Amino acid sequence: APPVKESSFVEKMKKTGRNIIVFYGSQTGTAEEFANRLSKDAHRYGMRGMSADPEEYDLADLSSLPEIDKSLVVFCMATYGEGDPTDNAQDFYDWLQETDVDLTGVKFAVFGLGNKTYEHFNAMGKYVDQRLEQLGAQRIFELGLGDDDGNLEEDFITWREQFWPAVCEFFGVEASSIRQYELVVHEDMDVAKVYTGEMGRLKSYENQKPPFDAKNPFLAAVTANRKLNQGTERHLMHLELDISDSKIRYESGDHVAVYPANDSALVNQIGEILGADLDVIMSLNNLDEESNKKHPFPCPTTYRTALTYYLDITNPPRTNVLYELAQYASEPSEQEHLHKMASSSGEGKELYLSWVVEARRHILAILQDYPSLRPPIDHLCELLPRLQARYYSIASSSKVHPNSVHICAVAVEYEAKSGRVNKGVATSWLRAKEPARALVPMFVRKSQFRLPFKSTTPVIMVGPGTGIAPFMGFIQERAWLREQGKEVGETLLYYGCRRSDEDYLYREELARFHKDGALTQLNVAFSREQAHKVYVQHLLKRDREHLWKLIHEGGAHIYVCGDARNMAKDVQNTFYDIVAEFGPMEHTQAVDYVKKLMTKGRYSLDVWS
Ligand SMILES: Cc1cc2nc3c(=O)[nH]c(=O)nc-3n(C[C@H](O)[C@H](O)[C@H](O)COP(=O)(O)OP(=O)(O)OC[C@H]3O[C@@H](n4cnc5c(N)ncnc54)[C@H](O)[C@@H]3O)c2cc1C
Ligand SMILES: Cc1cc2nc3c(=O)[nH]c(=O)nc-3n(C[C@H](O)[C@H](O)[C@H](O)COP(=O)(O)O)c2cc1C
Ligand SMILES: Nc1ncnc2c1ncn2[C@@H]1O[C@H](CO)[C@@H](O)[C@H]1OP(=O)(O)O
């Protein structure tokens, strides 16, 4: 960055006969997928659309959109940490805040993607919807607020079903399977031109050249991969990735992303059940010669490679995918069930929610349970979403391990109501990496989760379970700072696990840090060692007096890592209670006080799932 912007999107629409453009603010591909669905929808209403990444354009050109008759712009925007825009929407967000351009004549609609388990729920979607109106544009349809904590796919379905009629009524317009790509099989292909799993340029995995990032991941050697937990209820692991000579920089608190490979057995079974040759070399070429998206993923390549490295074959298929696949089910009842999965209500929706989503049925499961469903492999590859990278909180300090990035994760393996055992893609793949050479394509994503600039500032870390991850780096660093002869303030860890002899992660290492004084306190809540639950917040409440002292008089920084659904909220509530008792102040003021700590960078979060 800064990336070189494409030419005016309005002129592109004029040259290609498009009247609707749908921008996506996305990081995990959800909003991008929703934008593509809306763009494709345009055709069924006598219109023509295109989806677009805002980062590739100058949104100031919106002021020219009215030059196209019956034009409209839709924004599908997801929100990230602290109500910020997705990385690809930062330029647009800053422009909205700074600009004063008049958007009179512009017609817009916004669908926001968020999750109610966060403070700033759909902050981006809300901001864009508000700002465009302030700039003079006119809203054509109500803001959509999708919540990933319930069911986002359904929120989109409901919104979309009302959106189009509204557009048709306003513009006075009125309302067959179509493919975006064409299959080209390559019979005499030179092996040197066939992709084999790389993400960017051909052979970029074999021939590595910095700088390394999301488009050019560095293949890091797995130098260590060991089981962290004592018991066998689950599998928790510690991996060390060698980033020597990658020139990659990182700090404790940052995240490492990895591009995994799907289970080979699963890939094989999909090809097997479809009666397809997975080793066929081919390309899926966009039927729209004007679009910059030439292929759905790196091509040419084999179906096996696409299914292994480029496509998501484990998450429940979205309704549009099942809708398009229905045409390939020869049993009427099965074609009907698949068709109705896109319903906004009734039994069709109920079935999608229970049989597909709740049961966690992936594509192969559906092909097995609806045996008449036998789609051509090429169309299936065009429908499946892209395989996303997985993020992990770096468990090492670059002050201590500048050439190694550590990872602490729990392997995902569970019983699904679908009747099968589902395996986590990234963790199963990581678990199988054996030192001596096992390579892991990765890159680092800078975060704002960081130790205080001043070594003297107190630190309160709360990270039960895998939430301990970033704190191992924090502690290594604070330990290093002391060893370097600096004045280090109190460093407190509030950790938690089920039992000391089951899953007390880094037990030995933490004991050492404690003994040496790197950890002023090592408070551990063993949730299952007694009849009642003992959690980290119970220990925080226990130490309320001292914590208030560190917070209100010591300028302590609070860090919470791990489970975002329940733990983070329970911990936040405990801090509210501590402030309310020691301020003293009413609950309402204690809440503002704590939320202020967040805005002032003294209460940071690294929570997920
Ligand atoms: C910023 C950030 C930091 C993270 N840090 C870490 C970290 O340091 N350590 C770590 O372990 N993880 C961390 N993660 C989570 C990590 O990115 C992956 O989501 C996790 O490792 C699982 O990935 P996977 O590919 O193995 O599983 P996937 O194949 O992606 O499957 C994950 C999905 O399985 C489903 N699922 C899991 N259990 C069940 C169940 N029992 N019943 C029904 N559905 C279930 C859920 O839909 C879950 O989303 C972090 C995530 C984020 C966003
Ligand atoms: C690290 C992380 C931080 C998030 N922060 C927020 C947030 O502050 N507010 C919100 O409403 N949703 C938040 N979400 C939820 C996403 O907005 C939601 O899952 C969205 O569907 C993701 O879309 P994408 O796949 O197109 O990026 C967060 C998700 C992750 C993984
Ligand atoms: N709501 C919550 N608040 C704090 N810790 C929680 C929690 N829910 C579960 N935990 C605990 O976090 C640790 C890592 O998962 C476990 O000890 C788990 O205990 P439990 O599983 O026995 O409930």
Coordinates of C-alpha atoms in Angstrom, one line a residue, residues 268-556:
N268 CA -10.9 -37.9 -2.5
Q269 CA -14.4 -38.8 -1.4
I270 CA -15.9 -35.8 -3.1
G271 CA -14.3 -36.8 -6.4
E272 CA -15.3 -40.4 -5.8
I273 CA -19.0 -39.7 -5.1
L274 CA -19.2 -37.4 -8.1
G275 CA -17.5 -39.9 -10.3
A276 CA -15.0 -37.2 -11.3
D277 CA -11.3 -37.4 -12.2
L278 CA -9.7 -35.0 -9.7
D279 CA -6.4 -35.0 -11.6
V280 CA -7.8 -33.3 -14.7
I281 CA -6.0 -30.0 -15.3
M282 CA -8.3 -27.1 -16.1
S283 CA -9.2 -23.5 -15.8
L284 CA -12.5 -21.8 -15.0
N285 CA -12.6 -18.6 -17.0
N286 CA -14.9 -15.7 -16.3
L287 CA -17.5 -15.4 -19.1
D288 CA -17.3 -11.6 -18.5
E289 CA -14.1 -10.8 -20.4
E290 CA -14.1 -7.3 -18.8
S291 CA -13.9 -8.3 -15.2
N292 CA -10.5 -8.4 -13.5
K293 CA -11.4 -11.6 -11.7
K294 CA -10.3 -14.0 -14.4
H295 CA -10.7 -17.2 -12.3
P296 CA -12.5 -18.2 -9.1
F297 CA -9.0 -19.3 -7.8
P298 CA -5.5 -19.8 -9.3
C299 CA -5.7 -21.5 -12.7
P300 CA -4.8 -23.6 -14.4
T301 CA -4.9 -26.3 -11.7
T302 CA -6.4 -29.7 -11.0
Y303 CA -9.7 -30.2 -9.2
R304 CA -7.7 -32.0 -6.5
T305 CA -5.5 -28.9 -5.9
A306 CA -8.5 -26.6 -5.9
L307 CA -10.4 -28.7 -3.4
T308 CA -7.3 -29.1 -1.2
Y309 CA -5.9 -25.6 -1.1
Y310 CA -8.4 -23.1 -2.6
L311 CA -11.9 -24.1 -1.6
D312 CA -13.8 -24.3 1.6
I313 CA -15.3 -27.9 1.7
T314 CA -16.1 -28.1 5.4
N315 CA -18.3 -25.3 6.4
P316 CA -22.1 -25.7 5.8
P317 CA -22.9 -24.5 2.3
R318 CA -24.8 -21.2 2.0
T319 CA -28.4 -21.2 0.7
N320 CA -27.5 -20.0 -2.8
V321 CA -25.1 -22.8 -3.3
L322 CA -27.7 -25.4 -2.4
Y323 CA -30.3 -23.5 -4.5
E324 CA -28.0 -23.8 -7.6
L325 CA -27.2 -27.4 -6.9
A326 CA -30.8 -28.5 -6.8
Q327 CA -31.0 -28.8 -10.5
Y328 CA -28.6 -31.7 -10.2
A329 CA -30.7 -33.8 -7.8
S330 CA -32.7 -36.4 -9.9
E331 CA -35.0 -37.3 -7.0
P332 CA -37.9 -34.8 -7.0
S333 CA -38.1 -34.7 -3.2
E334 CA -34.3 -33.9 -2.9
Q335 CA -34.4 -31.3 -5.6
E336 CA -37.3 -29.7 -3.7
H337 CA -35.6 -29.7 -0.3
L338 CA -32.4 -28.1 -1.8
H339 CA -34.5 -25.5 -3.7
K340 CA -36.4 -24.4 -0.5
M341 CA -33.2 -24.0 1.6
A342 CA -33.2 -20.4 0.4
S343 CA -36.7 -19.7 1.9
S344 CA -37.1 -16.7 4.2
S345 CA -39.6 -18.6 6.3
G346 CA -41.5 -21.9 6.7
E347 CA -40.2 -25.4 6.8
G348 CA -37.6 -24.8 4.0
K349 CA -35.8 -22.4 6.3
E350 CA -36.3 -24.6 9.3
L351 CA -34.7 -27.5 7.4
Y352 CA -31.8 -25.4 6.3
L353 CA -31.2 -24.2 9.9
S354 CA -31.5 -27.7 11.5
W355 CA -30.3 -30.2 8.8
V356 CA -27.6 -28.1 7.3
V357 CA -26.4 -25.5 9.8
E358 CA -27.1 -27.0 13.2
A359 CA -26.0 -30.5 12.1
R360 CA -22.9 -28.9 10.5
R361 CA -23.3 -30.8 7.3
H362 CA -20.5 -30.0 4.8
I363 CA -20.8 -30.5 1.1
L364 CA -19.8 -34.2 1.1
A365 CA -22.3 -34.9 3.9
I366 CA -25.1 -33.4 1.7
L367 CA -24.0 -35.4 -1.3
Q368 CA -24.1 -38.6 0.8
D369 CA -27.5 -37.9 2.5
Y370 CA -29.2 -36.6 -0.7
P371 CA -27.7 -39.4 -3.0
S372 CA -29.6 -38.2 -6.1
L373 CA -27.5 -35.0 -6.0
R374 CA -24.7 -35.4 -8.5
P375 CA -23.5 -32.1 -9.8
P376 CA -20.6 -31.8 -12.3
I377 CA -17.4 -31.1 -10.5
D378 CA -16.6 -27.9 -12.4
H379 CA -19.8 -26.2 -11.5
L380 CA -19.4 -27.2 -7.9
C381 CA -15.9 -25.7 -7.8
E382 CA -17.4 -22.4 -9.1
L383 CA -20.0 -22.4 -6.3
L384 CA -17.8 -23.3 -3.2
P385 CA -16.3 -20.4 -1.2
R386 CA -12.6 -19.8 -1.0
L387 CA -10.6 -21.5 1.7
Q388 CA -9.6 -18.8 4.3
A389 CA -6.4 -18.4 6.3
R390 CA -6.7 -19.1 10.0
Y391 CA -5.3 -16.6 12.7
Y392 CA -3.5 -17.5 15.9
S393 CA -2.3 -15.2 18.6
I394 CA 1.5 -15.3 18.5
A395 CA 2.7 -17.0 21.7
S396 CA 6.2 -15.7 21.6
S397 CA 8.1 -12.4 22.1
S398 CA 10.2 -11.1 19.2
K399 CA 12.6 -9.7 21.9
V400 CA 13.4 -13.3 22.9
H401 CA 12.6 -15.2 19.7
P402 CA 13.0 -12.8 16.7
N403 CA 13.3 -15.7 14.2
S404 CA 10.5 -17.9 15.5
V405 CA 6.7 -17.4 15.8
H406 CA 5.0 -19.7 18.3
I407 CA 1.4 -20.9 18.2
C408 CA -0.8 -22.4 20.9
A409 CA -4.0 -24.0 19.7
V410 CA -6.6 -26.6 20.5
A411 CA -7.3 -29.1 17.8
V412 CA -10.9 -29.0 16.7
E413 CA -12.6 -32.4 16.5
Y414 CA -16.2 -32.9 17.4
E415 CA -19.4 -35.0 17.0
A416 CA -21.8 -33.2 14.7
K417 CA -25.5 -33.8 14.7
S418 CA -25.0 -34.9 11.1
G419 CA -23.7 -38.1 12.6
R420 CA -20.1 -37.7 11.5
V421 CA -17.0 -36.4 13.3
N422 CA -16.0 -33.0 11.9
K423 CA -12.3 -32.0 11.9
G424 CA -11.0 -28.5 12.1
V425 CA -9.2 -27.7 8.8
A426 CA -6.2 -25.6 10.1
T427 CA -5.7 -27.4 13.4
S428 CA -5.9 -30.9 12.0
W429 CA -3.4 -29.8 9.4
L430 CA -1.1 -28.1 11.9
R431 CA -1.4 -31.1 14.3
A432 CA 0.0 -33.4 11.6
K433 CA 3.0 -31.2 10.8
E434 CA 6.1 -33.1 12.0
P435 CA 9.4 -31.3 12.6
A436 CA 12.0 -32.5 10.1
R437 CA 10.7 -30.5 6.1
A438 CA 7.2 -29.6 7.1
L439 CA 6.4 -26.1 5.8
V440 CA 3.6 -23.8 6.9
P441 CA 2.5 -20.9 4.5
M442 CA 2.1 -17.9 6.8
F443 CA 2.2 -14.2 7.4
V444 CA 1.9 -11.8 10.2
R445 CA -1.0 -9.4 10.8
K446 CA -0.2 -6.4 13.1
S447 CA -2.6 -5.9 16.0
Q448 CA -3.1 -3.2 18.6
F449 CA -2.9 -5.7 21.4
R450 CA 0.4 -4.6 23.0
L451 CA 2.3 -4.4 26.3
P452 CA 2.6 -0.9 27.7
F453 CA 5.3 1.3 26.2
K454 CA 6.6 2.0 29.7
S455 CA 8.1 -1.1 31.5
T456 CA 7.0 0.4 34.8
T457 CA 3.3 0.2 33.9
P458 CA 1.4 -2.6 35.7
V459 CA -0.1 -5.4 33.6
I460 CA -3.2 -7.5 34.4
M461 CA -3.6 -10.4 32.0
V462 CA -6.7 -12.5 31.9
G463 CA -6.5 -15.5 29.5
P464 CA -8.1 -18.8 30.4
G465 CA -7.6 -21.9 28.2
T466 CA -6.0 -21.0 24.8
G467 CA -6.4 -17.4 25.9
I468 CA -3.0 -17.8 27.5
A469 CA -1.4 -17.6 24.0
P470 CA -0.4 -13.9 23.7
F471 CA 0.5 -13.8 27.4
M472 CA 3.3 -16.3 27.0
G473 CA 4.9 -13.7 24.7
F474 CA 4.0 -10.9 27.1
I475 CA 5.6 -12.7 30.1
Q476 CA 8.8 -13.7 28.1
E477 CA 9.1 -10.0 27.2
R478 CA 8.5 -8.7 30.7
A479 CA 11.0 -11.3 31.9
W480 CA 13.5 -10.1 29.3
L481 CA 13.0 -6.5 30.3
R482 CA 13.9 -7.3 33.9
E483 CA 16.9 -9.3 32.7
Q484 CA 18.0 -6.2 30.7
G485 CA 18.0 -4.4 34.0
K486 CA 14.8 -2.3 33.4
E487 CA 12.3 -1.3 36.1
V488 CA 9.2 -3.5 35.5
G489 CA 5.9 -2.9 37.2
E490 CA 3.7 -5.7 38.5
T491 CA 2.8 -8.4 36.0
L492 CA -0.3 -10.4 37.0
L493 CA -1.7 -13.4 35.2
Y494 CA -5.2 -14.7 35.7
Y495 CA -5.3 -18.1 34.0
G496 CA -7.7 -21.0 34.0
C497 CA -8.1 -24.6 32.9
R498 CA -10.2 -27.6 33.9
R499 CA -7.6 -29.5 36.1
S500 CA -4.0 -29.1 37.0
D501 CA -3.3 -32.6 35.6
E502 CA -5.5 -32.3 32.5
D503 CA -4.9 -29.1 30.6
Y504 CA -2.7 -26.6 32.6
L505 CA -0.9 -25.2 29.6
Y506 CA 2.7 -24.1 29.9
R507 CA 2.6 -25.3 33.5
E508 CA 6.4 -25.7 33.8
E509 CA 7.2 -22.4 32.0
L510 CA 4.8 -20.4 34.1
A511 CA 6.1 -21.9 37.3
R512 CA 9.6 -20.8 36.3
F513 CA 8.5 -17.2 35.4
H514 CA 6.7 -17.1 38.8
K515 CA 9.7 -18.4 40.7
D516 CA 12.1 -15.9 39.0
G517 CA 9.7 -13.0 39.7
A518 CA 8.7 -12.3 36.1
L519 CA 5.2 -13.0 37.2
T520 CA 4.2 -11.0 40.3
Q521 CA 1.2 -13.3 40.7
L522 CA 0.2 -16.6 39.0
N523 CA -3.5 -16.9 39.8
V524 CA -5.0 -20.1 38.3
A525 CA -8.7 -21.1 38.4
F526 CA -9.2 -24.8 38.1
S527 CA -12.8 -25.0 36.9
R528 CA -13.3 -28.7 37.5
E529 CA -11.3 -29.6 40.5
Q530 CA -14.2 -29.0 42.8
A531 CA -18.0 -29.4 42.6
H532 CA -18.5 -25.7 41.9
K533 CA -16.9 -23.8 39.0
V534 CA -13.9 -21.6 39.7
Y535 CA -13.2 -19.2 36.9
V536 CA -10.8 -16.3 36.4
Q537 CA -13.4 -13.7 37.2
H538 CA -13.8 -15.3 40.6
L539 CA -10.1 -14.6 41.3
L540 CA -10.4 -11.1 39.9
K541 CA -13.3 -10.5 42.4
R542 CA -11.1 -12.0 45.1
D543 CA -8.3 -9.5 44.4
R544 CA -10.7 -6.6 43.8
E545 CA -9.0 -4.2 46.3
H546 CA -5.5 -4.6 44.8
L547 CA -6.7 -4.6 41.2
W548 CA -8.6 -1.3 41.8
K549 CA -5.4 0.1 43.3
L550 CA -3.3 -0.9 40.2
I551 CA -6.1 0.4 37.9
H552 CA -7.1 3.6 39.5
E553 CA -3.7 4.7 41.0
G554 CA -1.2 2.5 39.1
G555 CA -2.3 3.2 35.6
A556 CA -2.5 -0.6 34.9

